[PDB]
């Protein structure tokens, strides 16, 4: 099950080692999720000085187990089910007319805190593009994450397109292709 863990406020730790076009950086963040209301409160810090990429681009990368699942949909919650053991979240993000992120993360419980450790590698980004050129506005929009369960992985698949507002009035799209998978070996449900 696992729902017992999320019945109340859960403290969160997130760590990211990124590499984008050779630019290396580390981001840490702390806060608390509430799965009952589906709320996240987090503060992130880059320890390497200036962030080579805009913060909004790291948002989707930086714990969907805190999503609120209505009572009738509770049996459909994959994320909470894998806990405390946790799950592996992999993504490939295609930035329109630009480079691509590739991430590997392990989301599990270390002690009483939920931990997400990410490894990100970007490539083929335009030096003057919206990402490396920091042309993206500081804000985020509303989205839909379409989840389909996939087969032999004993886990779920996902895709969606993130809309990043560019400061010139245009929109920078990011196509997300996501797949997850448990850690412990056995039934999930």
């Amino acid at each position: 099950k696992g729902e017992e863990l999320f019945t109340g406020v859960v403290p969160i730790l997130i760590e990211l080692d990124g590499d984008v076009n050779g630019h290396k950086f580390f981001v840490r963040g702390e806060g608390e999720g509430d799965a009952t209301i589906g709320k996240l409160s987090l503060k992130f810090i880059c320890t390497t000085g200036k962030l080579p990429v805009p913060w909004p681009t790291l948002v989707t990368t930086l714990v969907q187990c805190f999503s609120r699942y209505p009572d009738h949909m509770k049996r459909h919650d994959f994320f909470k089910s894998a806990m405390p053991e946790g799950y592996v979240q992999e993504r490939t993000i295609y930035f329109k007319d630009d480079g691509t992120y590739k991430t590997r993360a392990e989301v599990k419980f270390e002690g009483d805190t939920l931990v997400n450790r990410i490894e990100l590698k970007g490539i083929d980004f335009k030096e003057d593009g919206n990402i490396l050129g920091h042309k993206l506005e500081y804000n985020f929009n509303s989205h839909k994450v379409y989840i389909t369960a996939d087969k032999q992985n004993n886990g779920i698949k996902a895709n969606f397109t993130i809309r990043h507002n560019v400061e010139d009035g245009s929109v920078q799209l990011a196509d997300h292709y996501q797949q997850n998978t448990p850690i412990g070996d056995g039934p999930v449900l």
Binding site: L40, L62, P70, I147, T148, A149, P187, L189
Partner: protein, 257 residues
């Protein structure tokens, strides 16, 4: 007086049935405490094994003399002995499949004798019964009430389906990004709201059946008023192909209101 039904009783059961054109026979032995509401049984498939369909539709057809009744509630089926009683049952499953049963309960040499005839019909080939996707029965409540000079009962019975997957749904997201004005490092403050949607109906985990049973005593004994019986059936064990199955049941009667 408890001279007829003892505190511990054994029974023997025979079932001949046909489901989706598949004939078969089952013989089994059972035992329990009629006044405590508890019984067990071990069933064997003597013909037409292995069975192409789910065992769970057969399990409820293998014993109401074992129900625990309060003193103020007349036990109609216990009083029917030594002569005994018969029952007939119609199970209507949500996908159109139907199970019908006729049974005879007698008592010989201090042992109950059960004789069962069953038919399943119109079970869809991709349905959970023919696909063996059932996980067993949820706890049941049978509404009992006198009618037509007999004792009748009515159940809304939930069969648990094999867990498949998350299916298809989506997450709606909202996010605000802010800054800590006193924070001296490059940073992002974030607050996010996520809620799942895309499924209303709430039941993909269950296979429902409308059940109506009629219990007739062979002799004119005393009928109870309308009341309820709580029932829970468990499969305690079984082999791979379900040609050997052990069952357990607890049933206790209580007042309706």
């Amino acid at each position: 007086n408890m001279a007829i039904i003892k505190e511990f009783m054994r029974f023997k059961v025979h079932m001949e049935g046909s489901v989706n054109g598949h004939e078969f026979e089952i013989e089994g032995e059972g035992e329990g405490h009629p006044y405590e509401g508890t019984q067990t049984a071990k069933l064997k498939v003597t013909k037409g094994g292995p069975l192409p369909f789910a065992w769970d539709i057969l399990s409820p057809q293998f014993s109401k003399a074992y129900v625990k009744h309060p003193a103020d509630i007349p036990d109609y089926l216990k009083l029917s002995f030594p002569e005994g009683f018969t029952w007939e049952r119609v199970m209507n499953f949500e996908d159109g499949g139907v199970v019908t049963v006729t049974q005879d309960s007698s008592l010989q040499d201090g042992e109950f004798i059960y004789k069962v005839k069953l038919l399943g019909t119109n079970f869809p080939s991709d349905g959970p019964v023919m696909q063996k996707k059932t996980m067993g029965w949820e706890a049941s409540t049978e509404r009992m009430y006198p009618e037509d000079g007999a004792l009748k009962g009515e159940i809304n019975q939930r069969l648990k389906l094999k867990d498949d997957l998350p299916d298809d749904h989506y997450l709606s997201t909202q996010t605000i990004l802010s800054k800590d004005l006193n924070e001296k490092r490059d940073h992002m403050v974030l607050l996010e709201y996520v809620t799942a949607a895309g499924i209303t109906d709430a039941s993909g985990g269950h296979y429902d059946a409308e059940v109506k049973t009629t219990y007739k005593a062979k002799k004119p004994v005393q009928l109870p008023g309308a009341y309820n019986v709580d029932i829970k059936l468990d499969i305690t064990s079984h082999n791979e192909d379900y040609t050997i199955v052990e069952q357990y049941e607890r049933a206790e009667g209580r007042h309706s209101t």
